[PDB]
Each structure stands twice: as structure tokens, then as C-alpha cells.
Amino acid sequence: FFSCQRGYKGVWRGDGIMQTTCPCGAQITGHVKNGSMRIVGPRTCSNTWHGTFPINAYTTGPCTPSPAPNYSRALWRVAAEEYVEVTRVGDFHYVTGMTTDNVKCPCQVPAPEFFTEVDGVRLHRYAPACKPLLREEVTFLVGLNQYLVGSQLPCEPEPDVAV
Amino acid sequence: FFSCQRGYKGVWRGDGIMQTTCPCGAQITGHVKNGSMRIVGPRTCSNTWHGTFPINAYTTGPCTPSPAPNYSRALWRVAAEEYVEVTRVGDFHYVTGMTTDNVKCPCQVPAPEFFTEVDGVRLHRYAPACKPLLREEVTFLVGLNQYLVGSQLPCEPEPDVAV
Ligand SMILES: [Zn+2]
Ligand SMILES: [Zn+2]
Numbered sequence: 447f448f449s450c451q452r453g454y455k456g457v458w459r460g461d462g463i464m465q466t467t468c469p470c471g472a473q474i475t476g477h478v479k480n481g482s483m484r485i486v487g488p489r490t491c492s493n494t495w496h497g498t499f500p501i502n503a504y505t506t507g508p509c510t511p512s513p514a515p516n517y518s519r520a521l522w523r524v525a526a527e528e529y530v531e532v533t534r535v536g537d538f539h540y541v542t543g544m545t546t547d548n549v550k551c552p553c554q555v556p557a558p559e560f561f562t563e564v565d566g567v568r569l570h571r572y573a574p575a576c577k578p579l580l581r582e583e584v585t586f587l588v589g590l591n592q593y594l595v596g597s598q599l600p601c602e603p604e605p606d607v608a609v
Numbered sequence: 610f611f612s613c614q615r616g617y618k619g620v621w622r623g624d625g626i627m628q629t630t631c632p633c634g635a636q637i638t639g640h641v642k643n644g645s646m647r648i649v650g651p652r653t654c655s656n657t658w659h660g661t662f663p664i665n666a667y668t669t670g671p672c673t674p675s676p677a678p679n680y681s682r683a684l685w686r687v688a689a690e691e692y693v694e695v696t697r698v699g700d701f702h703y704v705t706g707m708t709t710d711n712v713k714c715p716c717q718v719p720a721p722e723f724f725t726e727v728d729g730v731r732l733h734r735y736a737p738a739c740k741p742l743l744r745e746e747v748t749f750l751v752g753l754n755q756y757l758v759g760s761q762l763p764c765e766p767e768p769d770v771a772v
């Protein structure tokens with residue numbers, strides 16, 4: 447079969463029993479109580495050993511992923527098949543990449559749970575493949591304004607010169 | 610729907626037609642002439658846009674991946690289902706992680722093609738699931754000698770500090 451999917455491990459919102467299937471074919475069960483998920487799976491799957499849960503189109507359950515705000519990068523789906531990469535520096539966020547040049551984009555990042563992917567871990571059951579990320583000489587649209595790649599999001603207060 | 614696997618892109622040894630399948634379901638064909646690969650795949654698969662080839666148990670064909678030596682890290686299968694992580698610094702290699710404590714390991718690294726994984730890109734058609742990498746207070750073996758995780762391979766000239 448295929449290699450195992452890099453699973454998610456962190457706080458979950460709402461309790462219950464989560465179900466999913468890893469690309470290696472293994473079925474993984476996550477019992478969520480008080481925000482913590484206990485993993486049950488085959489010794490054959492990597493997620494079992496890491497105590498992680500691979501979120502797929504195969505994932506089932508009532509609980510929701512609740513990622514920590516201190517990620518490095520995230521994949522943000524700003525259209526049905528288009529993404530933008532969000533790089534985090536301290537309290538600020540910068541659009542460091544885009545699947546297409548001139549993609550429209552919101553002026554504020556959402557909560558981590560709204561990202562399709564965070565530091566390599568998928569969080570959504572629905573995720574279109576991600577075309578190559580364009581990180582230079584391209585721009586994104588926030589309303590009617592244009593911003594060169596690498597620009598922090600428009601509605602974010604600029605970092606003062608305190609160092 | 611599963612995420613696309615990160616595919617290999619680089620020199621191959623031996624010419625012929627390579628065939629494989631991405632976890633996303635896409636069939637991918639790689640045409641190799643003079644160690645170079647032309648990719649034929651669906652616009653729906655990430656490997657198609659990157660012009661990469663996902664090596665799996667579903668991989669078929671006469672060619673062998675021929676990775677570059679300037680890699681940073683790599684998974685080295687040193688048992689049926691055990692791994693050691695290799696980090697490279699210049700011309701030196703260090704066992705920077707392991708699947709289970711006290712794994713017997715060779716004294717020097719092989720050509721990159723013998724690594725199950727190189728910088729997150731699978732190279733082997735056969736790759737058991739990799740358990741969490743123990744990177745602290747654990748040791749590995751080389752013949753009859755024990756080494757603390759982090760030490761460079763015994764059969765390599767040990768450089769001076771500050772070098
Ligand atoms: Zn698995
Ligand atoms: Zn694919």
C-alpha cells in the first residue's frame with residue numbers, strides 16, 4: 447500500500463468517537479474525552495505509534511480539530527481549487543505563496559481549524575490537490591488592492607520597530 | 610480522497626518505462642531515457658504538476674532512483690521494521706534518530722539509493738511503517754560498540770570541533 451499519512455495530535459473540540467482510514471489501509475479509532483484523543487489502531491500503522499489521527503475524506507465523527515496558534519506555516523484554501531501559503535512570524539502572518547498568481551484573499555487569517563493544512567498535517571476532510579506554490583514575483587488580491595508575495599495580511603497592525 | 614504523495618524528481622539509473630500510483634488514485638507514468646524522466650499524469654494529481662514520481666509498492670519498472678548526495682536527512686532501514694535517521698553535515702553522517710533503542714547499525718552510509726527515504730521523499734517500493742524517532746538518551750550499535758544517539762558513523766573520519 448501507500449505510506450502512512452502524517453496524522454494530527456492535539457486538542458479536539460467536542461467529545462465522541464472519531465473514525466478514519468490511513469493511506470496504508472489501516473482503520474484508526476480515536477476516542478475523545480475532555481479534549482484528548484486516545485488512539486486505537488494496528489501496530490502496522492505509523493499513526494498508531496505516534497498516537498496521531500490522519501484526517502481524510504474517510505474521516506468520520508462529531509469532534510473537531512483545534513490546532514495551537516503557534517504553527518510555522520499553513521495551507522489556506524481561498525477558492526475551490528486554489529491555495530495560499532501562510533507563514534507565521536510571532537503575532538503576524540504573511541502570504542508567502544499561492545497556487546495561482548493574483549488570487550483573491552481575505553485580509554485576516556482565520557482560526558487554525560480553518561486551514562486545510564498546518565505544518566504538514568491535514569485538518570480537513572475535503573482537500574483538493576495543491577498545485578506548485580508560487581513564492582516570487584506574483585501577487586494576491588485583498589479586495590481591490592494588490593500585494594506582492596511575502597506581504598503580511600492588510601488588516602494586521604504592523605510590527606513596531608521595538609527590538 | 611487521500612493527499613498526493615511527495616514524489617521523486619532526479620536522476621535514475623537505467624532506461625525504460627516506469628509506472629506507479631499516487632495515493633490520490635492517479636496513475637503516473639515516467640519515461641526514462643538517459644537517466645531523465647518525463648512525467649505523464651492527471652492535472653488532478655500534485656505529482657503531475659511537480660513532475661515528480663511517487664515510489665510505492667505499486668511502483669513498477671526497470672529503473673532505480675539515483676538521489677543526489679547533498680541531502681539533509683534520510684531514513685535508513687536497518688532491520689525488517691526498524692529505522693535509523695541519518696543527518697548529513699558536509700561529508701559527515703550522524704545517526705540522529707532511531708525507531709527502537711539499541712539497533713545494530715552499519716559503520717558507514719550506503720549510496721543514497723539504499724535509503725528508504727530521503728528528505729521526506731520515499732525511494733523504496735517496500736517501506737514498513739516508520740515508528741516515532743527516538744532522538745534522546747538512546748543508543749545504537751555498530752558491531753560490538755555502543756554509541757549515544759547523535760554520534761557520527763564510526764567508519765568516517767571524525768572532524769575537529771569548530772570544523
Ligand atoms: Zn498508516
Ligand atoms: Zn496524486
